[PDB]
Coordinates of C-alpha atoms in Angstrom, one line a residue:
Chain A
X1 CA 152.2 151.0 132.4
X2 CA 149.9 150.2 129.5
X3 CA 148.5 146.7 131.1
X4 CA 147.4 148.7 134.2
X5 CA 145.7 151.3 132.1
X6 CA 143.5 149.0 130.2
X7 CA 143.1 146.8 133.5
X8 CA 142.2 149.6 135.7
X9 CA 139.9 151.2 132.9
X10 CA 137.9 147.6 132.4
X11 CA 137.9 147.5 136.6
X12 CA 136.2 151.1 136.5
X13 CA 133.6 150.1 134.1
X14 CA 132.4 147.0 135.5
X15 CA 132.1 148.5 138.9
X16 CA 130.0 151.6 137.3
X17 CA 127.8 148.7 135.6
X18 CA 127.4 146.8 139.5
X19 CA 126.9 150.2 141.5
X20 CA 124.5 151.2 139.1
X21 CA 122.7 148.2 138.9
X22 CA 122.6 148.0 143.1
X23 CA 121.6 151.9 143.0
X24 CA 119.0 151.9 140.7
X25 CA 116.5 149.5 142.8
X26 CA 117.3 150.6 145.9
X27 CA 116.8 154.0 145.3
X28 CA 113.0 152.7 143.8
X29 CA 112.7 151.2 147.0
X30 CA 113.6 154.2 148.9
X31 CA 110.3 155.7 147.2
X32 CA 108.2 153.4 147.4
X33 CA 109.2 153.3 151.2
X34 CA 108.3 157.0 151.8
X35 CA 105.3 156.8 149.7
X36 CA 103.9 153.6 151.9
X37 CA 104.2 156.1 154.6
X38 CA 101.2 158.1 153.8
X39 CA 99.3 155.0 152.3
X40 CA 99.7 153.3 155.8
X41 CA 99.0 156.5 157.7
X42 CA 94.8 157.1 158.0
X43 CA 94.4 155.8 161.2
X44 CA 97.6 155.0 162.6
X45 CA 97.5 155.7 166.2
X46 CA 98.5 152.6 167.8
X47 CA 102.1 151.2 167.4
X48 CA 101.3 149.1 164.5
Chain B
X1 CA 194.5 150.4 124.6
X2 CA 196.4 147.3 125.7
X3 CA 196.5 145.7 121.7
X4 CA 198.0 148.4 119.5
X5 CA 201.1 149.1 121.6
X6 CA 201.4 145.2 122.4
X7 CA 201.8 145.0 118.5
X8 CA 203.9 147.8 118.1
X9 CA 206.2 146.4 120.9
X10 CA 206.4 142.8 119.3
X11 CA 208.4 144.5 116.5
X12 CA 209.7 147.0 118.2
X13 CA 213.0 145.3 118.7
X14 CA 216.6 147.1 119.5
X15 CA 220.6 145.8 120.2
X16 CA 220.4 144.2 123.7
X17 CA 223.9 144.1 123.5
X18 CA 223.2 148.6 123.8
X19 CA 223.1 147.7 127.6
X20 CA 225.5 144.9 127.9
X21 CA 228.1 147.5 126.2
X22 CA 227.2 149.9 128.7
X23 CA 227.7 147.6 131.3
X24 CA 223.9 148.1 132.6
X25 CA 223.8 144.3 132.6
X26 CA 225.8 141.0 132.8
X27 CA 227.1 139.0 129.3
X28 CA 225.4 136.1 130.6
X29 CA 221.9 138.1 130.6
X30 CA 222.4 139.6 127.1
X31 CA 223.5 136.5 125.6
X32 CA 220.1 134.1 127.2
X33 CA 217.6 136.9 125.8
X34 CA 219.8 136.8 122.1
X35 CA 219.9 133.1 121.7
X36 CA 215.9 133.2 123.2
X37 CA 215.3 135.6 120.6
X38 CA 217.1 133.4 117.6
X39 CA 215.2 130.1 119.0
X40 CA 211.9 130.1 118.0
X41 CA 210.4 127.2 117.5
X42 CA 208.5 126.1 120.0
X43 CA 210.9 122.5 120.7
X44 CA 214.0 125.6 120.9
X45 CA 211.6 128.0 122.9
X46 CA 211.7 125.0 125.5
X47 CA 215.3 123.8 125.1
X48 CA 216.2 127.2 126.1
X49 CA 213.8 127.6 129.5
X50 CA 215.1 123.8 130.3
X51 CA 219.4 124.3 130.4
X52 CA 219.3 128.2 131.2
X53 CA 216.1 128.1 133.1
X54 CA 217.7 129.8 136.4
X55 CA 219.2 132.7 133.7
X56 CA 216.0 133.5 132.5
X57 CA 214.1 135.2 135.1
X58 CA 217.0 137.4 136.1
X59 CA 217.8 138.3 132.2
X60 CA 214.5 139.4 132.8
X61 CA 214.5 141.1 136.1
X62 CA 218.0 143.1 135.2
X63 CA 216.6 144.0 132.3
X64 CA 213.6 145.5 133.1
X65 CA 215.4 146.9 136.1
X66 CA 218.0 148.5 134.0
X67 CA 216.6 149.7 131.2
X68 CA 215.6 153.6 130.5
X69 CA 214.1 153.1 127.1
X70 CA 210.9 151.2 127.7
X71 CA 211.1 149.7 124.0
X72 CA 213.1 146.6 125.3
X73 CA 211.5 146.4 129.0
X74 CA 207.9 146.0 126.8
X75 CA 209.0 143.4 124.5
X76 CA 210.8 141.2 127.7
X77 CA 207.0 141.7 129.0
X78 CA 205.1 141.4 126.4
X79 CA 207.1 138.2 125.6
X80 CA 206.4 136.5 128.9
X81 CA 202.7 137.4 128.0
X82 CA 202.6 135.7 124.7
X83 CA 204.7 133.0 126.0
X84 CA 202.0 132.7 129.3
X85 CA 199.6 132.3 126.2
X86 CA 201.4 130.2 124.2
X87 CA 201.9 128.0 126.8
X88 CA 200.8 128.6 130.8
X89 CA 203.0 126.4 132.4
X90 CA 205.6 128.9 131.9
X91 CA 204.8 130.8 134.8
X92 CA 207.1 127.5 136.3
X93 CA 210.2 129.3 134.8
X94 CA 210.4 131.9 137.3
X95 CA 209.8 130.2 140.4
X96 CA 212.2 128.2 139.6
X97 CA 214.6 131.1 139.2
X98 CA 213.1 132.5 142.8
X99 CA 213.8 129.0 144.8
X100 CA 217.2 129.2 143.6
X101 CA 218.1 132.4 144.6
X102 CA 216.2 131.2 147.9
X103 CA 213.9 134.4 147.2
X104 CA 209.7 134.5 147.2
X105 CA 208.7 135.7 143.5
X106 CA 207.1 139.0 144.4
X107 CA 209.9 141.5 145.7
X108 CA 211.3 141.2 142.2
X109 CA 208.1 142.5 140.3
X110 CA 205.9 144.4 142.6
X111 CA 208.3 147.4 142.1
X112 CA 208.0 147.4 138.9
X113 CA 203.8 148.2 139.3
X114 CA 205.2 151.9 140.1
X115 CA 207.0 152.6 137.0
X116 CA 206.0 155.1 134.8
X117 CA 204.5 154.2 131.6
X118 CA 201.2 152.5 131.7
X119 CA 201.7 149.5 128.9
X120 CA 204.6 148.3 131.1
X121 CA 203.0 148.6 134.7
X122 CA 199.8 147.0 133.6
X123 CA 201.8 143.9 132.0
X124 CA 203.5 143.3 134.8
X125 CA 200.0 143.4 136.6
X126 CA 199.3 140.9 133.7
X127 CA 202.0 138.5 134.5
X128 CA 201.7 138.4 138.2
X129 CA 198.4 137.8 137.5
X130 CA 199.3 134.7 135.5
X131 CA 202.0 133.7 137.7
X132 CA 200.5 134.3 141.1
X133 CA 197.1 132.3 139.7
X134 CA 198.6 129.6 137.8
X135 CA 201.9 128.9 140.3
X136 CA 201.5 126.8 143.6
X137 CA 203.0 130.4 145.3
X138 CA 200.3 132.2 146.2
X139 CA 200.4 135.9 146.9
X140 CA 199.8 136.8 150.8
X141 CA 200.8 139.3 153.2
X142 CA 201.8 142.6 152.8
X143 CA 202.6 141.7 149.2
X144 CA 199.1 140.8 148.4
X145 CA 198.3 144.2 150.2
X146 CA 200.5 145.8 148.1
X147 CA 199.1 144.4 145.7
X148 CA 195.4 145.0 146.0
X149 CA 196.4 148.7 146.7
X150 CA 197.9 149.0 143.8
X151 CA 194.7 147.8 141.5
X152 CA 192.6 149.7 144.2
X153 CA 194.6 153.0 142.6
X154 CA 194.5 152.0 139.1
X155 CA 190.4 151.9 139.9
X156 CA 191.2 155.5 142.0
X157 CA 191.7 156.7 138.5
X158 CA 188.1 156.5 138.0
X159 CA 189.1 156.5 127.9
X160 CA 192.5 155.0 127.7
X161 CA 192.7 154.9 131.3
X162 CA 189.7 153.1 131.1
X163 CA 191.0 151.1 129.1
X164 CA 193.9 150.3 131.2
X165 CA 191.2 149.9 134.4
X166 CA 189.9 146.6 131.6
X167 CA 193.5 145.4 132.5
X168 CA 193.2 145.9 136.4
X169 CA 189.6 144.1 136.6
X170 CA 191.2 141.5 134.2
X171 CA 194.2 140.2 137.0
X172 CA 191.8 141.1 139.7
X173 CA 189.3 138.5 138.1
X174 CA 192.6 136.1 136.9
X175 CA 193.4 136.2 140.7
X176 CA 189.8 135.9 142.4
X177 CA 189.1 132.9 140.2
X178 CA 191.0 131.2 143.3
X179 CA 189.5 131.0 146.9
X180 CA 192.0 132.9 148.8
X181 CA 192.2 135.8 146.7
X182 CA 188.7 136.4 146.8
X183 CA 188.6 136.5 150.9
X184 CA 191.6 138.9 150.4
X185 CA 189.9 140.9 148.0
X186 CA 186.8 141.0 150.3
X187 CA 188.8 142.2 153.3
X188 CA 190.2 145.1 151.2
X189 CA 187.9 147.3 150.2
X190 CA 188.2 146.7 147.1
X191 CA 184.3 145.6 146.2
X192 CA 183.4 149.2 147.7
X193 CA 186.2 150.2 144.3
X194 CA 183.8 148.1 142.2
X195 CA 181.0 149.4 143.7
X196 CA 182.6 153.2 143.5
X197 CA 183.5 152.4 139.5
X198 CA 179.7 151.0 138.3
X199 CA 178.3 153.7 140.1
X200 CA 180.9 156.2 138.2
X201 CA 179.7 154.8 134.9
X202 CA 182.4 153.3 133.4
X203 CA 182.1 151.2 130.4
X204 CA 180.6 148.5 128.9
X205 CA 183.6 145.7 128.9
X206 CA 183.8 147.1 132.6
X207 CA 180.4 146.1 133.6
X208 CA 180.9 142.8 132.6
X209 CA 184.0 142.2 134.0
X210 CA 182.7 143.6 137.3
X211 CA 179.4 141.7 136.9
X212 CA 182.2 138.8 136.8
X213 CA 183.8 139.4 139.9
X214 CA 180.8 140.0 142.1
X215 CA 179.9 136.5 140.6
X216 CA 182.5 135.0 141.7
X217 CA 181.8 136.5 144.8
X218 CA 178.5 134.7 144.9
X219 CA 179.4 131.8 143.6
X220 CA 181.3 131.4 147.4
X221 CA 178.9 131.0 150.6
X222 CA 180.6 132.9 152.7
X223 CA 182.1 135.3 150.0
X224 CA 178.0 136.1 149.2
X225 CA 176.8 136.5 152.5
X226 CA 179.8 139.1 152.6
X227 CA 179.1 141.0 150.1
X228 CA 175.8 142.2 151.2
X229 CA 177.0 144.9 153.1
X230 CA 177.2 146.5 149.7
X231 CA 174.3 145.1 148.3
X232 CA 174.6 145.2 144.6
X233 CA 171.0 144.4 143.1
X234 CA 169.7 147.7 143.7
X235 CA 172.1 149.2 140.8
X236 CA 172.2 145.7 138.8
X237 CA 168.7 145.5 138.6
X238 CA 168.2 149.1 137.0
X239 CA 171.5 149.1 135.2
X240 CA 170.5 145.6 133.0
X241 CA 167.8 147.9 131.6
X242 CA 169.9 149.5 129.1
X243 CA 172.6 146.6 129.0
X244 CA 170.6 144.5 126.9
X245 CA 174.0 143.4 125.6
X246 CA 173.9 139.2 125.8
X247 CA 177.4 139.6 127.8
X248 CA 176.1 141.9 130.7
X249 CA 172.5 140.3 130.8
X250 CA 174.1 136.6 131.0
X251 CA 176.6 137.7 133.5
X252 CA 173.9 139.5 136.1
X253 CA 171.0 136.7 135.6
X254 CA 174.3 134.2 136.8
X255 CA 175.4 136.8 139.4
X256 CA 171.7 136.9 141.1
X257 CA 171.4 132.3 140.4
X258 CA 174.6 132.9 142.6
X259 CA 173.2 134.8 145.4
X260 CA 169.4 133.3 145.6
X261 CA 171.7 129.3 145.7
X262 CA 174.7 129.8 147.8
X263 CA 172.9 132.8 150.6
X264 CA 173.6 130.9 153.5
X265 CA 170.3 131.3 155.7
X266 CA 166.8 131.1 154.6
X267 CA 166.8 134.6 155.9
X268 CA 169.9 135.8 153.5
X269 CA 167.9 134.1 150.9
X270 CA 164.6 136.3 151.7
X271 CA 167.0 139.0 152.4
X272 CA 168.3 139.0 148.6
X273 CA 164.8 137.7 146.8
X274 CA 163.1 141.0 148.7
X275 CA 165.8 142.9 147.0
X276 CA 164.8 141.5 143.4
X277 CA 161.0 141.6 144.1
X278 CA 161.1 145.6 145.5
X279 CA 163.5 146.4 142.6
X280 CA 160.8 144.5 140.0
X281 CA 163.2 141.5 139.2
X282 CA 160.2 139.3 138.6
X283 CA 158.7 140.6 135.4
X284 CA 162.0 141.1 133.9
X285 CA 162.5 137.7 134.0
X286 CA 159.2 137.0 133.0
X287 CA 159.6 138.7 129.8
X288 CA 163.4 137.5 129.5
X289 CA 161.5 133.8 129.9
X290 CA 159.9 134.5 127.1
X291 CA 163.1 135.5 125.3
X292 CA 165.0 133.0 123.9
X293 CA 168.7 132.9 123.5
X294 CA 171.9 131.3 122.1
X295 CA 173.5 129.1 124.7
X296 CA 172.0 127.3 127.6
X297 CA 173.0 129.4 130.8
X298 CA 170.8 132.3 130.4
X299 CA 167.8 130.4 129.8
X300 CA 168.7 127.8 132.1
X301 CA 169.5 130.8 134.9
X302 CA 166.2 132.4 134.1
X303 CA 164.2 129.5 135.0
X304 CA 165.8 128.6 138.0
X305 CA 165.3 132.5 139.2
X306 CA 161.8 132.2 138.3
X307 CA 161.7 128.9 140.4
X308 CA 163.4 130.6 143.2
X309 CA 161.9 134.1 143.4
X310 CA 158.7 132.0 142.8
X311 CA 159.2 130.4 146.0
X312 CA 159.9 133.4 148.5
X313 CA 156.7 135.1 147.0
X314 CA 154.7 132.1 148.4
X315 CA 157.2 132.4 151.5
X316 CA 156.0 136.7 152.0
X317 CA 152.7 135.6 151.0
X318 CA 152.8 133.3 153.9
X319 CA 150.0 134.0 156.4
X320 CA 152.7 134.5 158.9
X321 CA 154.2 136.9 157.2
X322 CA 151.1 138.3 156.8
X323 CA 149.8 138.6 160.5
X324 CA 153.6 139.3 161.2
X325 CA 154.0 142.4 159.0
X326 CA 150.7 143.6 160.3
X327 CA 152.5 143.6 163.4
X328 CA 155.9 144.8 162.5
X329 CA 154.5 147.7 160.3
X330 CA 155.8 146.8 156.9
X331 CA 152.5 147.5 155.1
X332 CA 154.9 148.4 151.8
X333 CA 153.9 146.3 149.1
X334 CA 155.2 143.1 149.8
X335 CA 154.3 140.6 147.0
X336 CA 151.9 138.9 149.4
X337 CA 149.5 142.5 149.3
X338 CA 149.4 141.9 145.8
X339 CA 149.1 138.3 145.1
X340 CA 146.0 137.2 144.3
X341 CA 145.6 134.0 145.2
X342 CA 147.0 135.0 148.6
X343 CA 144.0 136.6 149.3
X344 CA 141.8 134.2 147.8
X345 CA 143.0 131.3 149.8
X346 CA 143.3 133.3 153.3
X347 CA 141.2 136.1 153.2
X348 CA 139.3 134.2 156.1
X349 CA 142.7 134.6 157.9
X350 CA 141.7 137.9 158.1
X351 CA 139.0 137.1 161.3
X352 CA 141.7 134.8 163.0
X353 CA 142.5 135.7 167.0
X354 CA 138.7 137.5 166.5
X355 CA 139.7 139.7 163.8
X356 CA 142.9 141.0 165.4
X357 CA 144.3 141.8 161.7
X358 CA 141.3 144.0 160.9
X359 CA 141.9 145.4 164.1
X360 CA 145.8 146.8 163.6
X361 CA 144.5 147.8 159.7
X362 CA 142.1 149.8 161.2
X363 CA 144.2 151.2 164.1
X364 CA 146.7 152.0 161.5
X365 CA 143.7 153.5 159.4
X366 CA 144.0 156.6 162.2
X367 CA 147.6 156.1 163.6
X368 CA 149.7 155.7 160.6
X369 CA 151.7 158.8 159.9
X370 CA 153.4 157.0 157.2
X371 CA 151.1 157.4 153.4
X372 CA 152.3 154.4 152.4
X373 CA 151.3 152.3 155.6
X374 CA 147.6 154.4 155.6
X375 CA 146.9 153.6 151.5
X376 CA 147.9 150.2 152.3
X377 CA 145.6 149.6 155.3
X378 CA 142.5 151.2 153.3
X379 CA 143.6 148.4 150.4
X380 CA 144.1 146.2 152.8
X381 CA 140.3 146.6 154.4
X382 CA 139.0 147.0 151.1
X383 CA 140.8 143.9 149.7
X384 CA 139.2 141.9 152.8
X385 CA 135.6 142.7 151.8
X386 CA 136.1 142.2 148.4
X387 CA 137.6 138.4 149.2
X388 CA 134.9 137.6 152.2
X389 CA 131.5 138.9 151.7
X390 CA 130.5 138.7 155.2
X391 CA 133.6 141.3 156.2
X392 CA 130.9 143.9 154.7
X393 CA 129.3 144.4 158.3
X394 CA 132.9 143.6 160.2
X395 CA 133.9 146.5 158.3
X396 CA 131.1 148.7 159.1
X397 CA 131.4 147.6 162.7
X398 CA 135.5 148.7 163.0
X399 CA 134.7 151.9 161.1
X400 CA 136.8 150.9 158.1
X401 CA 133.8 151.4 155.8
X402 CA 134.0 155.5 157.3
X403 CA 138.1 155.1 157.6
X404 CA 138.6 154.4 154.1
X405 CA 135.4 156.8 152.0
X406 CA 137.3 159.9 154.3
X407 CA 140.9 159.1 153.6
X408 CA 139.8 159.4 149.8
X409 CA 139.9 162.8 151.4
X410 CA 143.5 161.8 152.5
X411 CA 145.9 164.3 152.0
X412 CA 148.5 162.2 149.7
X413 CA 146.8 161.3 146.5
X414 CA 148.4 157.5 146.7
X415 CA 146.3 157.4 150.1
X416 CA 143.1 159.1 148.7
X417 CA 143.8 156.6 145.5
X418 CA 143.8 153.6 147.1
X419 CA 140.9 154.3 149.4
X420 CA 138.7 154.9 146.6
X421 CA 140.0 151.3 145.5
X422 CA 138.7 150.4 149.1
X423 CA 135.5 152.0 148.6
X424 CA 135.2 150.1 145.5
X425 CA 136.1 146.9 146.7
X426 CA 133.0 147.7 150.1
X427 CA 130.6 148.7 147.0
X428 CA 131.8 145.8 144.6
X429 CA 127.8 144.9 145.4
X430 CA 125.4 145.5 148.3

């Protein structure tokens, strides 16, 4: 019982440190997505 | 039980001439158990079984046929006891006696199992024991029926009768320690009586001795692949937690060498190893591995069950066995859903016959009424990613990725737990 508790614990933490890690950058990406948005849009009409 | 009244009875001596008096018996009788009694020494002992050997057996008969008083009918058997131990070739004595009166040994004694006082019937259990064992007469028949029956009712009892029951598994084990009283024991039902006494909790000599006979059991082929229809390990396994005693723990790690060596069929031996593994038999003797002890069989035993049980978890974690499980169902935690290096080495097995095993995980993700089968299909998808990166947009593609982050919504916490373990495994990175 006590080997899966510490093993489970140390599983939890090291996933927290990778989601984290992914999350943080992708979520400045998302930003700097929407924000690109309004720098591309003065005149664009055509497609691209 | 068995010691103090022996004891008592080996002094408890009386007039056999009482009897003889009475005319309950013959002069001839009397006088062989007197001058018996006056010659001692062993050299006397024997002069007396050698020129009145054909008197000695019916001195004994008659008297314990005769007698009320049980004081002189328990030192005639307790006599023949010590003398078995003193010397086992004396079970000779009596067949001797029964070839000359042209008679087979049993009619003489098997009454006597249904007397009344408990001492007495289980030394003559005792004696046959020794006799029918040692002797080149075998017990068979409706005597050996009888027989059986009769330790199959001493077990019905089921403490001094408990006591007395030590007795009863001792001549069952004296008798099954040859081949053709084991197959008779088998065809009685006499291993569902050891079966019925374990489960009764009976006590701790008795577990031993019972542990004794089932190996025995095991140690024959056929005898093992018989004895399944009870199948044993379920209790043994459990029941070797609290006996920690050397006896009991020697006895079952022999018991299960026994089955995993002489189960006749690669299938009997998966049959037996599945057992161990589902009842946790592997870190047991992990741990008992690391225990050391006093002679060489346990140790010796433990290794070779560590070799073996070794062996059929590379056999489940089999990539057949896999694929084949998949197919038959049995997503229950066979050692090959948790073996590590199983899934490191075949993970890729995983897109074989164009991911037909993702396919039945994720089929099973929505058609498995069973919580166990639905956890281990989430753990099974999430174990998949986690082993072959590219299964990250296979997954998405199947609808595992959705399958798994709902059934964390699951209504059985073991299914929502494992399909967060899922989810983990899909989010282990991007």
């Amino acid at each position: 019982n006590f080997e899966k508790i510490e093993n489970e614990l140390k599983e939890i933490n090291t996933n927290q440190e990778a989601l984290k890690r992914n999350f943080l950058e992708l979520t400045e990406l998302k930003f700097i997505l929407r924000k690109t948005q309004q720098f591309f849009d003065e005149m664009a009409d055509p497609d691209l | 039980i068995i010691a103090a009244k022996a004891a008592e009875v080996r002094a408890n001596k009386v007039n056999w001439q009482s009897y003889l008096q009475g005319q309950m018996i013959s002069a001839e009788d009397c006088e062989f158990i007197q001058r018996f009694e006056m010659k001692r020494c062993s050299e006397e002992k024997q002069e007396m079984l050698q020129t009145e050997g054909s008197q000695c057996a019916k001195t004994f008969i008659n008297l314990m046929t005769h007698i009320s008083k049980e004081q002189t009918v328990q030192y005639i058997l307790t006599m023949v006891d010590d003398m078995l131990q003193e010397n086992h070739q004396r079970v000779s004595i009596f067949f001797d006696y029964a070839k000359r009166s042209k008679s087979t040994a049993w009619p003489y004694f098997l009454p006597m199992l249904n007397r009344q006082d408990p001492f007495t019937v289980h030394m003559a259990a005792r004696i046959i024991a020794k006799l029918a064992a040692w002797g080149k007469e075998l017990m068979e028949g409706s005597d050996l029926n009888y027989y059986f029956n009769w330790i199959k009712t001493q077990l019905s009892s089921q403490s001094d009768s408990s006591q007395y029951v030590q007795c009863v598994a001792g001549c069952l084990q004296l008798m099954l320690r040859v081949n053709e009283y084991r197959f008779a024991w088998v065809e009685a039902d006499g291993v569902n009586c050891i079966m019925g006494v374990l489960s009764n909790k009976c006590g701790f000599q008795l577990q031993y001795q019972m542990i004794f006979s089932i190996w025995l059991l095991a140690f024959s082929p056929q005898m093992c692949e018989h004895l399944r229809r009870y199948n044993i390990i379920p209790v043994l396994s459990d029941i070797l937690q609290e006996s920690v005693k050397e006896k009991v723990t020697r006895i079952i790690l022999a018991a299960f060498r026994n089955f995993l060596e002489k189960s006749t069929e690669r299938e009997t031996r998966q049959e037996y190893a599945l057992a161990m593994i589902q009842c946790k038999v592997l870190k047991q003797l992990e741990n008992l591995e690391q225990q050391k002890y006093d002679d060489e069989d346990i140790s010796e035993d433990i290794k070779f069950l560590l070799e073996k049980l070794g062996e059929s978890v590379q056999d489940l974690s089999s990539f057949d066995e896999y694929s084949s499980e998949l197919k038959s169902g049995r997503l229950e935690w066979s050692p090959v859903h948790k073996s590590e290096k199983f899934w490191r080495e075949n993970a890729v097995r995983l897109n074989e016959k164009n991911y037909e095993l993702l396919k039945i995980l994720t089929k099973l993700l929505e058609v498995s009424d069973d919580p166990q089968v639905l956890a281990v299909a989430a753990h099974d998808v999430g174990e998949y990613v986690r082993h072959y990166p590219r299964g990250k947009r296979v997954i998405e593609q199947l609808g595992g990725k959705q399958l798994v982050m709902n059934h964390m919504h699951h209504e059985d916490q073991q299914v929502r737990y494992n399909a967060l373990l899922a989810v983990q495994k899909l989010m282990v990175h991007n």
